[PDB]
Every structure is written in C-alpha cells, then in structure tokens.
Amino acid sequence: EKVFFVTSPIYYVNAAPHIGHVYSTLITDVIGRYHRVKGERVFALTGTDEHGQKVAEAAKQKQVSPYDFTTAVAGEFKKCFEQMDYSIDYFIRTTNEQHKAVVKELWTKLEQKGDIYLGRYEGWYSISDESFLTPQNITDGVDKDGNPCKVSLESGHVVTWVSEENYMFRLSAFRERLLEWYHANPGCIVPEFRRREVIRAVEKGLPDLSVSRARATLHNWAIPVPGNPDHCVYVWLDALTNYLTGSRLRVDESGKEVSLVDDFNELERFPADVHVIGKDILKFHAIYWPAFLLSAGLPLPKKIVAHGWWTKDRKKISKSNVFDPVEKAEEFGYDALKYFLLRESGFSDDGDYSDKNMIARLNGELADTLGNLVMRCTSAKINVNGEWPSPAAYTEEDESLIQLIKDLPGTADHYYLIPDIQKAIIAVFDVLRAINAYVTDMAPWKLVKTDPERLRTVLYITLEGVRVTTLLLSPILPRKSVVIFDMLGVPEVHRKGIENFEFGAVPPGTRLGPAVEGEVLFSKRST
Template sequence: MWLWDSTSNMLRFLPSRIFTNIVRLSSRCGSTEAANRDAVGTRPHLYTTPIFYVNASPHLGHVYSALLADVQHRYSAMCGIESRLSTGTDEHGMKVQQAASALSLDPHTFCSSVSLQFRNIFDDLDISYTDFVRTTEPRHKEAVSRFWMTLEERGYIYKGTYEGWYCTSDEAFLSEGQTAERIDSEGNKIRVSLESGHQVHWVSEENYMFRLSSLRPALLNWLQTEPVHPAPFLRLVHHWLEEELPDLSVSRQRSRLSWGIPVPSDSSHVIYVWLDALVNYLTAAGYPNLQLAPWGPSTHLLGKDILRFHAIYWPAFLIAAGLSPPHKLLVHSHWTSEGTKMSKSLKNVVDPADCIRRYTKDGLRYYLLRHGAPERDCDFTHRTARTLLNSELADALGGLLNRCTAPAINPMQHFPKFHYDSFPSAAHDQLQGVLANLQNLPAEVDQWVKKFQVHKALECIDACVRRSNAFFQSQAPWKLQRGVEKEAALRDSVIYVTLESLRLYATLLQPAVPGLATAALERLGVPLEMRTLKGNTFLAATRGESCYFQGQTLGPEKGLLFPRLERCEAL
C-alpha cells in the first residue's frame, strides 16, 4: 500500500498484509499551500469571472463562467489557501446606451436593473463571490482614471487617427484580416467579424491610441509561462501574435458615445469600454491603493469569445502600467441548446432561473459542471440533465447514503466499529480495491481541479461512489445477523467503510454542490471544523488501532438527499 509521508514528503510502501489505508489530505493540501505561498508570496489569490455585459439578462454561459470560478475559489479555501472571488457587471458602451434608449430609460437606471438580475441569479446559485464590481461605481471610475493616467505618464498613449472596422455588438476594433464579406438573410453584402459573426462598420475618427505593437516581445515572454488553459486556447493566442498587432484605439469621441468614463485629460473623449471593463480586476484588488491590497496572483475565468481581450489587450495594459500580467486564464467554450446555438428568435434560450426551479440550484450546478468540458462546446438538453441527475445524485450518491443510514441497517445511527478480522479472506481483495480507489481519489480530484477539468474530477468521484455501492451490495450487511458475533462485526465494518467513504465524497463535492454536500455531511454528523481538506484524515482504518471517526453519531434524517426527477411534459 503506498502512503504519503508528510514528515519526509515522500511516498512510502506499507505491506498490504499489515492493512493500513490512510488518506492524508493534510499533507497534500499542505504541500500545495506551501508551493502556492512560495510562488506568490503571502498575497491572497484573486479568482475572477468576467464582468457581464448588461445589454441582456443572465444566460447559461454567464452562469457556467461563475460556477467554474466558484469551484476554484471554494477548493482553494478547502485546502487552506487564502483567496477571493470577484464578479460584477460591465455597464458602459454603445450597446448599453442603445438598449437603455430603446426602453426609454436613462442608462444608469437600466444598468441597475439588469445588474441586480445577475447578482440575484448568482446568489440563488450560491456563487461565493467576495466582491461584486459595477463599472458605474465611483471606486471603479477612480481606478480606471488612475490606470489611464499611468499609461499616459509611461508614454503608452498618444493621440492619432483610427481608421478601420468596428463591431458595436462586440465593442471591438478589428483589422482587415479579422473580418470577411458575407451575404445577410436579405441577400445584401455585409462585412462581419470572423470571430463572432457580428456585423462590422467602417469608422474613421481621431482617438487616443495605445502602443500595443511595441508590446509583442513582452506578451510572447509572458506566454512562455503557459498561462492560458486548456492548451488549444494557448495555441490560438500564439497564432494571433504571429499576425499583425497594430496599435489599439482606446477612446471614443464623446459626440459619438456619451455613456462611458471620460478621459481624465480630455473630457471630449470617453475611455474605450474594454479598457474600462478589464480594469475591474484591479478595482477588486483595491487599486489604485495597492499598498493596502496589492495586485497579486490572479486567475481569470472567461468564455472563449473574449479570449483576445484577456490574452492580448489585458496583459499588454498591465505590462505597460508596470504591473504583473495575469497568473492564469482559464477559458471555456460555449453551451448550445439541442445542438443549436441559443437564440431568442429560435426560442431555445435556456433560462438559468427556470433550471433552478426544475432541478434545484445544486442540480443545475452539478449538471453544468459534470456535463460541461471547457475545451469543447457542450449541448444542454432537459433530457440529459434529468438522466444524469437521477443516475448520479439521486440513485448512486443519495441511494448509498440512504441505505447505510437507514434505521433497519444502522439502528444505533452512528459510525460503528471497524473490525479488520471480520472480513473473510475471499472479501479481502475487494476491500483492498475499494480502499485503494478511495486512497487515490483526493489526489485525482486535486489534479483535475488544478488542470481546470472539473468534469473529470466529478467523474472520478462518481466512479468511486459506484464502486462503494457495489461493495455495499456484494457484502449485503442487511443479511448479516446481529446476534452472531462474526456476522455482526462484518456488518459493522461494511457500514463503517461505506460511511467513511461517503464522508470523503461529500467533503470533495463541496466546491461543486455546496448545498447538497452540506446536507450529506450534516446527515453524517460531521462537525463544521472537519469539512475541510486541510489537516483532515479519511478512512484511517488500521488493524489493531481505533478508527478515526468511529463512534460518531449521525445527524438527523431530513428527507432524501436528492429526490428523483420525474418525467413530465415540460421536460
């Protein structure tokens, strides 16, 4: 049996005949924490979602970004690593100005209404953000103005004439090579963005320009640290930097766009909406007072459609201002509906609020995190959601918890005593296999979460849950008689191993499904201080020694962990 020795920081082999199976997550998370501290000092890690544009209500893609960031933030906390999570809303720009005008509202009133929708849906989903930044807030305006002045003072901003393509839908300036001619639905020739497919228009105006072209070497140097994940998106950024990298227009004339932050030295211009929006990450860090809250290690979660802004413009802005570029960019793909891109005209947009009503908040969280894969577009269907949730949460996990805590099986409602000698020799191999899988599980989950592959981490947990179900079923403790000493000892041992397994699963599931995991831990009677990965020990079942959680009383029964979702016409 291989075990991690925290004293020597190495794996040691213990003969299986001694039968020692101890999962020491404290050593793993402790070494992770030390590595993190060595790499980034004592500053808390900042995880961020994009700030979401308020020209439309929250959709599934927004929720997915927030959930992926939330998992990273919660997992860090479970390992004892100090971190923060920032989200918010992007409230300036032409699209917002036009959307507010169409509803006969002033822009600020319109922004406040939609921003509240985002905040409410994130609260409903238990997104554990520590800051919610609105770009219309005074603190953000101060940060943007100070950042602009820093770029200006360092010689990276100059006044010039921008002539080229502009996409209002994306709020993006585009080169000729980033556009193409297409035929619209009415047979007219139009030019569109190759990345988004949205129509572009030719503009020519005197703006302030940012010396982006001069920063290619610095950006290439930053890319050597492989900050963009998954790998296909890193290769895409390298490809972009092989192309022309012209200077970037970073202002719009106020006569054309009034809804924005004025250029500090020239009120006839407003600051480009993407420069304004990206600075929100600094706002969350306390900028410009970085002595109180230094700009430190940061991990940005984002959709692939805004990769260029985060992988080229944002690190360039930071480097130009004398600040560190992002530590990591974790990029995810899009969600489709029934195999088709979501569109209001097709009436196939999936409403997150409706999904919470159908599946509960933890059900929606689990489905998106388990079914989604960052490197590819994923398809949402109510059929697959219902099938997956019934199979993995209601039947496998919930069923196992219900069975080993049922009064008929566990009348004392506790973690019973473990007896190694109670297992017949024919059952030793199966027991060893179950315990070996459980021993490896924390490291596997840690690996996949760190690699931004949360769906793989959940897949590993589900596989172990199913092995535990098979073990429980094959040992059939309900058939063992309490009055027969050997059978009673085996019965207790099977229940102990199963309960301890569930304690491990519920602990590891907390970042993904915090509500459901908490319910499971409460049913298992796990104290709050033991719901962490730092300093916690699982499945300590050593021959001749008392078991770590032995004798712990279960918590009260409060109904099914996750009731099955029945088929209905609406689904």
C-alpha cells in the same frame, strides 16, 4: 501566500441575464469555493460592464436614459445571481466611482511610461462585441432589415467602419514579451489548444490598439480620458480594470464597498489566480490585459480559463430556446443543475443543454450513484446502532477501496487547480462507483446477521468513503453536501480543511444525524 483571487468576466448590461453568464460565474464560484474548502482565503468577483456604445445604444433603443437603464439591468443581474445561491465576495459595476478612479490611475500609469500616443484608427469594428477587427475577420452578410452589410466572422454581428483620431496603446511593443510569458508559463491559458491559438495570433503580429474614442460616438457614456475631455477610455481598458478595482475595494458584511486602498498589496488579492472567461473574449484577456499590465509595471495573472458556448437542443441560445436558469433551478434543483453544467461538458467543448440529458444525469449519477449510496450507508437496516463503527481487520479488498479513497483528494486537487472541473467530478464519481460495487459485493444486509464484527469494517469504510467524496463534491453540490453530512452526523469542523482529506479524520463512535422517514436526497424525475 495570498488571498486566492478568482474572477468572472463582467457582463454587458444591454439585456437580461441568461445561462451563459450564470455558467461563467458558477465556474468562478466553484473554484473560489474549493479553495475555501481547502482552508485558503479567497475573493470571488462577478459584475457588470456598463459603459460604452453597445450599452449606450441599447438604452436608446429602449427609450430611456443609460443611468436608469443600466441600474435596472444591473439589478436583474444581482437578483439572478443572488437566487443562483453562489458565494461571491463582490459584485462590481464600472459605473461605480471608485472604479473610475482606478481606470484613470491606470490610464495615467500607461501614459507615463510612453506607451500611449495620439494616432488614428481607420478600420472595422463590431459595436455588439466592442471589438476591432481586420478585413480578414469580416465577411459579407445580412443586415437586420435585410440590407447588404458586413458581419464579423467571429461574432456574426454587424461591423461598421470607423475613422477616428483615437489614443493608441503601443501593443506591438509587447509581442516578444507576451511570447515569453506564454512560454515561461506553459499552463497559463486553459484549455491547452486555446493557448496555442493565442500564440499563433501573437506569432504573426500585433498592431497598436485604440484605447480611446470620440466622445460623440459613444454618446458621452464612458470614462473620460485624463487631460482630454474630448475622448473616453475604450470600454475594454475600462472593463478589464474591474479586476484591479475589486482587488483594491474593501467590502463590509452587507456586500457593499467601503473603501479603495491606494495600493493593491494591502489586500493581497492582485494578481488574479484564475480569470474564468468565455472563448469569445480570449483576445482581450490573453493579449490586451497582460500587455497593459506589463506596461504599467503590474503583475500578470496566473491562469486564464477560456470555456465553450452553451446551446439548447443544438440550436443557439434564443434572441428569437428561451432559457431561464432560475426556473430550471426551481424545476430540477439548484445543485442538480449546477452539477449538470459542470459535468456535461468540459471547457474544450461547446456544451448542449437538453432537459432530457439532465434528467439522465440526475437519475443516474446524483440519485442512483451518490444519493443511493448515502441512503443505504446510513440506514437502521444496516447501521443498526446509528453510529460510526470501529473498523475490524482489513481485507486486501478493503485496502483496495481505501487506497482509492486515500488517493482521490490528491487527484481532484490537481484537476480543480488545472482547472478542469469535469475531470475532477468524474474522478470523484469513479471513487463513488467503486465504493458502491464494494458494498454490493460485501452484502452488509447479510452481514448484520452472519458477522457483525466484519460489518463494522464494511460500514466504516463505506461511510468514510461517502464522506471524503462528498467533501470533495462540496463546491459542486454546496447545499446537498451539507444534507449528506447531516445524515452522516459529521461534525462541522470535519466539513472543511485539508486535514479532513485524510482517510479516517472522523473517528468511530460518531453519531449519525436524525433519520427522517421521508427524506430523499435526490428525486428521480419523469423521462
């Protein structure tokens, strides 16, 4: 047993944060959260990637030193993510000294086992992606200022030629072993098809990788290569090591580091259980990262979730679709927008954000299915005693609904683990819709007069239903799930832990929380 260790990719500090990074870190957060709700110990980890030519030149463009610039931008990121009301255990920065120590340690480790040598790289490169590309991965396209240039087929950004004496990691040595790892662990890359892509790529062949760069090129704004000040460590070998650094930092109550353990075992975090990333950076996480680790005698991660790219109104996120997530959060609600991001598309798909679409999913899932159920379920009209009634005899119809509620956890457990947050959300909302049909059917408004003894069995099942679903929706709706429980008057101990996935863990005679006359759970908006 280990600390469950979930990651978010650390982001380039060249520009303000947006929905893309909020999205990636939310997925990180939800996986971390669910596992905590399971009662497991967890370490979630978002951060910023600060070194390298991309950011270095981003600082030059804004007429200011990288030190001042990166600190400032990295600050916008901590602010955004604080306001997004997450629950991550650390915000890492590659400018941090303890990190640098680890990168140098890893570098040395790799050198030691003869898998780094001094070579050349003569080929293409995208500064904007800090990615080496082969000629097949570039095409003709327009420079800014209209000039003919070469653009990346992956990114679309400008690619410049590079002819440098660089340090080379022996990636080609590791293709057969990588291929075993992909096959030995047929669920280590999700969604499935993105796995297949990785395997096709590795099936063809791997060249050795340039893991250092000419100091000059980077504007001296990267971690030096050990034993050779003339070089700096490739931004990605630096950036990828952030996962190993967070696994070795010890953190205090204010979220600041205090110490860097010598060994990764001391904190029982490494290797990552889930590396949430974007499809755009798969090759580094699924080919490079594991290759480095094997070289160095380290463990490999368990799972890499590579997701799709958001767009707004089908047009791509605006360099020049203004998208402030914190405002859309203030507009519609923070849990509401978290939900929408997680529900509106799965990891296989390139989601398309639309205000009107979210108004729909708010008004017709959160408000009208979930919210609606709760408002009836807890009411002086139906629940005249404001308690949890004792169940009478169970109808077969009762037993059907219950079986759905008994099963619902085990199913969502798989989907959360896959991970597929979408097929875990619907899974719950299938059970919420059922619970709702049942109640319309049983007509408890009528039963309060005809058959109070039967109304006990109806109200109780509903309540336990609404409870087990809300419990399993916690990581999606962290703040509203607490409001739901408060209305239900569930004890705090029954809001966490697998013991409370059991049907009927809250016993009858439990008193409902106070009834506020205005209290609406989710607010129906204009179309």
